[model samples]
Target: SDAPNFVLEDTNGKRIELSDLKGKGVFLNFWGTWCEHCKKEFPYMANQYKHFKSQGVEIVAVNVGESKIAVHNFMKSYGVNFPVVLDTDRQVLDAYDVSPLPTTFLINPEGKVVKVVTGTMTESMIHDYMNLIKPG
Candidate 1:
């Protein structure tokens, strides 16, 4: 299925729309600052973003109902380089039908969802997922 589109702002005040990344791979993640599993995956996600961003992949972490301060602090503590958007209304979360705090949707270059992942992801798993969506 095609991934749903939504307009959200990253902590840096940059606007990000899901459909804007049409020609590249997208790692669309739904997470909350209070989730333990979300915490575990940040470092792996951060590292993977550095490797994959140049490979035509983008990671958009949607902070589920968290304040900009909390999201900003978390990203700083984890040293994440990828963009993190705020889902203040959880409308995007509902639209995507995400139940878990750390669910991830892997969207390919053509904007089709190639895979859906839930819970924490290991470094290797994150690496493989990035490869799965990398533009051919």
Candidate 2:
């Protein structure tokens, strides 16, 4: 199915709309600073973002109902390069039907949901998933 569209601002106050990313692979992740599972994957995610960003893949980390300060601190601590949007209203969370602390939706270039992953992902697993969605 096509991924649901939503507009949210990243920690940097830049607006991010899902539909605008149609021509590139999107790693849409739902997370929070309180989730241990989410924290565990940050390093792996950070590493892969650098490797894949230049290859036409974009990672949008959605922080569920967290303050900008908290999310910003978390990202700084982890050295996250990808954009981290604040889902302050939980609208995007419900829109995507995400029930886990660290659910990832791998969307292809056409904006189709290619895969939905739950739980923490290892570095290698993240690498493979990014490859799966890399634009041709």
lDDT of each: 0.89, 0.90
Clashing pairs in 2: none
Report the alpha-carbon TM-score of model 1 versus the true structure: 0.96
lDDT of 1 by residue, 1-136 (tens): 8898899998878899888899999998998888888778898888888888998999999998888888888888878888888989989989999996789999999999999998567899999999999996
Task: Please identify model 1 stretches exceeding 4 Å from their true place.
Answer: none
Error of 1 at 97 (Å): 0.6
All-Cα superposition RMSD per candidate: 0.9, 0.9
Question: lDDT of candidate 1 vs native?
Answer: 0.89
